[PDB]
Design a protein around this ligand. Structure first.
Ligand SMILES: *[C@@H]1O[C@H](CO)[C@@H](O)[C@H](O)[C@H]1NC(C)=O
Length: 498
């Protein structure tokens, strides 16, 4: 019944974790071999495997003794004793955890058998981002490829999935062999893949549990009401993550993502064009992700590009994964909806008063919100030139409204257009002033002293304050375009002299 075997994995692991010779290597081999066979039953295969393991271990102890006796630290003995005890227990076929462990095994095995694919992908991603190298690049790339394939509608038949599991299993087997076999080799650098013996001493256990889940899976394979607003928020958060990416890993590449998000904010029907441009965003995201992972290796002889992609830590990649999953979900939704529309067209071939009241209230009382946003934009932090130009525009608008009011009714939308244009220019200028040539290019082109130039807001920020310096004007632009698109013309036709 509750006749377990994982105890043998446990003791084989603790036995191979501290002794390193040709004697423990076979113990590690058999440890790797355990998760392939079933639990002990009325069977001959697992029985003979166990019995041969015990024979080999006892004989190895005997060989150690017959070596040490010739005269013309031996925890392996206790391991052999435990192995023989388990052999006898199998031949036979206060206390709180007895059934607890059984329940744990049962529910975890059922968790594997239901949706093992996604947990394998999660393990692949974790192993990839754990310790970057050329070897872990295999795991990371197959992770990324599987996630991209799932993002598309194209599915996968289980036999190819199983052969991929077999390939990855033998690959991680060889990887663990190299890892726990390296304690003899004599090298320190000129080779990326591994190192010698959580920062980097927690990877082998992750690879081991990965291989164990893969082994259970392959063993299984050989037993022959408001969710619309939620979709809206989904594409919105995908866009905002696309924007926020270009702040963490500042480079002349992700500037295209930032400018794309900016130019996508200011469009009439943004959902349609966002869904259209979704796949390109996904492919570009994962491409620059591969570039990130490559240039985040262990070795400093890569000669990072000065203005473009540069050198980063391994930890600063999970945030990029969190960004890319938004693109993946966006593409999934877009493709599903497009397929539904296509099959539909193939098949063919009490609260209103609240809405009216609130839309009228916004038509009449939103220009004041846009005006009040000027103060929040211009009166935060230090005082610089562009924050003064903002107030200059605001005061000019108010003065022109007070003076004539006939021109002010004709030159209103042009004001908002100029405002959003100026905000875009401010974004571009404050973003580009973070490279290396620019802080000197401004002087060499237009000679101004360092602080005299910095007084215009241009300075070297940190990864925190730049979020503010980008989003505050971004929020202002968003509010302004929201006013311009929906409420402007209705407001202008509301208050007029007929
Ligand atoms: C400023 O930088 C440029 C970069 O090409 C270089 O010619 C020189 O260092 C300076 N040029 C000036 C001062 O015009």
């Amino acid at each position: 019944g509750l006749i377990f075997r994982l105890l043998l994995p446990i003791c084989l692991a603790v036995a191979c974790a501290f002794r390193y010779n040709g004697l423990s290597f076979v113990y590690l081999i058999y440890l790797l071999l355990i998760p392939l066979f079933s639990e002990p039953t009325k069977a001959t295969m697992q029985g003979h495997t166990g019995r041969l393991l015990q024979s080999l271990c006892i004989t190895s102890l005997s060989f150690l003794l017959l070596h040490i006796i010739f005269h013309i630290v031996f925890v392996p003995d206790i391991g052999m004793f435990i192995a023989s005890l388990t052999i006898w227990l199998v031949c036979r076929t206060l206390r709180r955890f007895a059934s607890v462990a059984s329940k744990l095994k049962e529910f975890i095995g059922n968790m594997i058998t239901t949706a093992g694919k996604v947990v394998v992908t999660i393990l692949l991603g974790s192993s990839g981002m754990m310790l970057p190298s050329l070897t872990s690049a295999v795991y990371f790339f197959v992770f990324l490829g599987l996630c991209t394939w799932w993002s598309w509608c194209r599915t996968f038949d289980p036999l190819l999935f199983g052969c991929l599991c077999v390939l990855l299993a033998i690959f991680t087997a060889g990887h663990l062999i190299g890892l726990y076999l390296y304690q003899f080799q004599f090298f320190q650098e000129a080779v990326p893949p591994n190192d010698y013996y959580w920062y980097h001493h927690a990877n082998p256990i992750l690879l081991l549990v990965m291989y164990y889940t893969l082994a259970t899976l392959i063993r299984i394979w050989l037993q022959e009401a408001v969710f619309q607003f939620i979709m809206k928020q989904s594409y919105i958060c995908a866009l905002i993550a696309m924007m926020a990416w270009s702040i963490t890993y500042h480079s002349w590449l992700t500037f295209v993502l930032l400018i794309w998000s900016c130019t996508l904010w200011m469009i009439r029907n943004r959902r349609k064009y966002a869904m259209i441009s979704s796949p390109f965003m996904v492919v570009y995201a994962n491409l620059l992700l591969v570039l990130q992972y490559i240039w985040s290796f262990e070795l400093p002889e890569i000669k990072k590009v000065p203005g473009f992609l540069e050198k980063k830590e391994p930890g600063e990649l999970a945030s990029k994964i969190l960004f890319t999953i938004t693109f993946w979900l966006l593409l999934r939704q877009h493709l599903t909806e497009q397929k539904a529309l296509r099959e539909k067209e193939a098949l063919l071939s009490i609260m209103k008063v609240l809405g009216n009241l609130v839309v009228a209230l916004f038509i009449k009382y939103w220009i004041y919100v846009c005006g009040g946003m000027f103060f929040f934009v211009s009166f935060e932090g230090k005082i610089v030139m562009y924050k003064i130009i903002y107030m200059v525009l605001f005061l000019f608008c108010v003065a022109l409204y007070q003076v004539h009011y006939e021109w002010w009714r004709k030159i209103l939308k042009y004001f908002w257009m100029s405002v959003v244009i100026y905000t875009m220019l401010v974004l571009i200028f404050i973003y580009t002033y973070q490279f290396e040539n620019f802080p000197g290019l401004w002087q060499n082109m237009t000679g101004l002293k360092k602080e005299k130039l910095e007084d215009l807001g241009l300075k070297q920020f940190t990864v925190a304050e730049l979020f503010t310096r980008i989003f505050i004007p971004t929020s202002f632009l968003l509010v302004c375009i929201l006013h311009l698109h929906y409420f402007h013309d209705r407001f202008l036709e509301l208050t007029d002299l007929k």
